[PDB]
Amino acid sequence: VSDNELQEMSNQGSKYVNKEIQNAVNGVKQIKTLIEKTNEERKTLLSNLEEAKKKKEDALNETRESETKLKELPGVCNETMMALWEECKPCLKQTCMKFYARVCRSGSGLVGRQLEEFLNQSSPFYFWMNGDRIDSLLENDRQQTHMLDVMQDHFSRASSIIDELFQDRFFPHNFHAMFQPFLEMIHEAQQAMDIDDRTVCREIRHNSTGCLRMKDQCDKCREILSVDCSTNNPSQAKLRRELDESLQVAERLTRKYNELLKSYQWKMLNTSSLLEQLNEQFNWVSRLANLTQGEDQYYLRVTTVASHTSDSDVPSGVTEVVVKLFDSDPITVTVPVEVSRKNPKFMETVAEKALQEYRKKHRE
Ligand SMILES: *[C@@H]1O[C@H](CO)[C@@H](O[C@@H]2O[C@H](CO)[C@@H](O)[C@H](O)[C@H]2NC(C)=O)[C@H](O)[C@H]1NC(C)=O
Ligand SMILES: *[C@@H]1O[C@H](CO)[C@@H](O)[C@H](O)[C@H]1NC(C)=O
Ligand SMILES: *[C@@H]1O[C@H](CO)[C@@H](O)[C@H](O)[C@H]1NC(C)=O
Ligand SMILES: *[C@@H]1O[C@H](CO)[C@@H](O)[C@H](O)[C@H]1NC(C)=O
Ligand SMILES: *[C@@H]1O[C@H](CO)[C@@H](O)[C@H](O)[C@H]1NC(C)=O
Ligand SMILES: *[C@@H]1O[C@H](CO)[C@@H](O)[C@H](O)[C@H]1NC(C)=O
Known part of the structure; x- marks a missing residue:
């Protein structure tokens, strides 16, 4: 994978983190109404x-x-x-x-x-x-x-x-x-x-x-x-x-x-x-x-993008993408090989799955 490619993928994947903020805030309102609804039931x-x-x-x-x-x-x-x-x-x-x-x-x-x-x-x-x-x-x-x-x-x-x-x-x-x-x-x-x-x-x-x-x-x-x-x-x-x-x-x-x-x-x-x-x-x-404090818009950095072709230990139909989130441990995410790297969904998947791992793991 090209080094100029990774930095643009990371730059793209960090935009999906700004979205997750608004998504998490909406999820509160989604729960808020569910409670009110259950309160009416x-x-x-x-x-x-x-x-x-x-x-x-x-x-x-x-x-x-x-x-x-x-x-x-x-x-x-x-x-x-x-x-x-x-x-x-x-x-x-x-x-x-x-x-x-x-x-x-x-x-x-x-x-x-x-x-x-x-x-x-x-x-x-x-x-x-x-x-x-x-x-x-x-x-x-x-x-x-x-x-x-x-x-x-x-x-x-x-x-x-x-x-x-x-x-x-x-x-x-x-x-x-x-x-x-x-x-x-x-x-x-x-x-x-x-x-x-x-x-x-x-x-x-x-x-x-x-x-x-x-x-x-x-x-x-x-x-x-x-x-x-x-x-x-x-x-x-x-x-x-x-x-x-x-x-x-x-x-x-x-x-x-x-x-x-x-x-x-x-x-x-x-x-x-x-x-x-x-x-x-x-x-x-x-x-x-x-x-997300500061003027920095980096949050995701793509380390390595491997496959069955390169690593060989990788399964036949997945691409393991190593990423760093919010300056923390490297996270490995398995997105299907069916997804092309050109697809904006590729980093959208990497980000979403990575945010889940950080949400569950990182102690805070
Ligand atoms: C309910 O009444 C019976 C009958 O009066 C009691 O049975 C007697 O119990 C005493 C003490 O063990 C014995 O000395 C008698 O021989 C029993 N009599 C008969 C006819 O069984 C029984 O104890 C009473 N239940 C109580 C007090 O909880
Ligand atoms: C909520 O209640 C319904 C029945 O009223 C039940 O089937 C369901 O499992 C309950 N959910 C939880 C999380 O308790
Ligand atoms: C048990 O039953 C009797 C008769 O109905 C009642 O007087 C008593 O309060 C009951 N005790 C308990 C602990 O429910
Ligand atoms: C009680 O039983 C006796 C003997 O069977 C009978 O003669 C009598 O009429 C009965 N009384 C009542 C109120 O059932
Ligand atoms: C109980 O039922 C009887 C007959 O229907 C009625 O006369 C009485 O007022 C009732 N009592 C209560 C407390 O509902
Ligand atoms: C956010 O930062 C403050 C200040 O360091 C800290 O006290 C708080 O626990 C942090 N909240 C979370 C959820 O990490």
């Missing part, structure tokens, strides 16, 4: 959760009403209920202790104590009136209300931090004066946002009440559900079915709310990833702004 998702919560809490009132209707229906349960209950508690305890020792593998004794402690402070009427499911829903409702109050407090806080950053009309040699205010705002926003058998064993750890799924295993507990109360009225089996149904509704609406929460979590994660990009982008314009 969750404001849409928030109003859906406002509505879904209303439908859920209305489905629970109807469940609480279907419950109390069954309670107030006159009539008494046969004393046989207490006889099963004393053979249902030891069966249920032994079952959950076995399951915990088998699958979960931990101290089955502690579980058995807590469960027996709960089974003595409970009545078989609780199981008969499906109180386990009723209380299960109420617990999930709190957590979903809490989990949203948590997400809403991190997001809307960071959202306001970002709504103070994006007010700057940005969206000189003394850029380090803008550098620190912007970069710290991104950090303050970032830290605001950061948060079968395996599952059941976790629920048994959280509360011994998780064992109540295994009531189906015990026969005596299954019998308790089929005892004649309400003096054997047809309204009983009618109200019991009406309760069963009003639960299914409240259970299904609780699921559909979780999927909207899991969606709200994706929005929160997505947005924190767009901040890491905005962070690394501002550290790239900072490095560029530093490295």
Whole structure:
């Protein structure tokens, strides 16, 4: 390669560095809108959760009403209920202790104590009136209300931090004066946002009440559900079915709310990833702004342009171009042989690929 050729190639390749400055600045604005867009997608998702919560809490009132209707229906349960209950508690305890020792593998004794402690402070009427499911829903409702109050407090806080950053009309040699205010705002926003058998064993750890799924295993507990109360009225089996149904509704609406929460979590994660990009982008314009101080328009210098013809170690269809960027280590870039050196795209490729290597490597 001619020496007069290299100096003109380098002089050409340095023009593509001046462009990368404007490109990196635009990339900030490209991220800026992506964040705002993602911020609007969750404001849409928030109003859906406002509505879904209303439908859920209305489905629970109807469940609480279907419950109390069954309670107030006159009539008494046969004393046989207490006889099963004393053979249902030891069966249920032994079952959950076995399951915990088998699958979960931990101290089955502690579980058995807590469960027996709960089974003595409970009545078989609780199981008969499906109180386990009723209380299960109420617990999930709190957590979903809490989990949203948590997400809403991190997001809307960071959202306001970002709504103070994006007010700057940005969206000189003394850029380090803008550098620190912007970069710290991104950090303050970032830290605001950061948060079968395996599952059941976790629920048994959280509360011994998780064992109540295994009531189906015990026969005596299954019998308790089929005892004649309400003096054997047809309204009983009618109200019991009406309760069963009003639960299914409240259970299904609780699921559909979780999927909207899991969606709200994706929005929160997505947005924190767009901040890491905005962070690394501002550290790239900072490095560029530093490295482009002065009246010098040299930034890229082509060292050697080799091929399979010259070096031979070079692969068959690439041309390895060694370059120095911003007065740093020599960088080797593989641009295809299909590209001719006459092509302005040749140095455009060398520059772009070289800027990537310097962006990832050079410590700053
Ligand atoms: C729940 O009640 C049962 C029955 O009263 C308790 O079982 C008794 O436990 C004591 C202490 O181990 C024994 O001396 C008795 O013989 C047991 N009686 C029967 C009928 O099993 C059980 O301990 C209670 N659960 C608690 C307190 O958590
Ligand atoms: C619950 O539903 C019943 C029947 O539809 C209604 O009379 C009652 O006002 C409701 N309560 C609430 C708090 O929504
Ligand atoms: C309880 O069972 C006994 C024996 O089967 C029966 O005579 C009685 O009518 C039952 N009472 C109720 C309320 O079901
Ligand atoms: C466990 O369940 C019982 C009954 O629903 C409840 O009183 C208690 O607060 C629960 N404990 C935890 C840690 O959720
Ligand atoms: C953003 O969320 C969508 C679903 O809403 C998901 O498919 C995608 O992987 C998420 N992206 C990131 C970076 O979390
Ligand atoms: C830019 O230069 C200043 C002054 O030397 C330095 O403190 C700062 O860390 C540099 N920024 C980058 C991104 O290298």
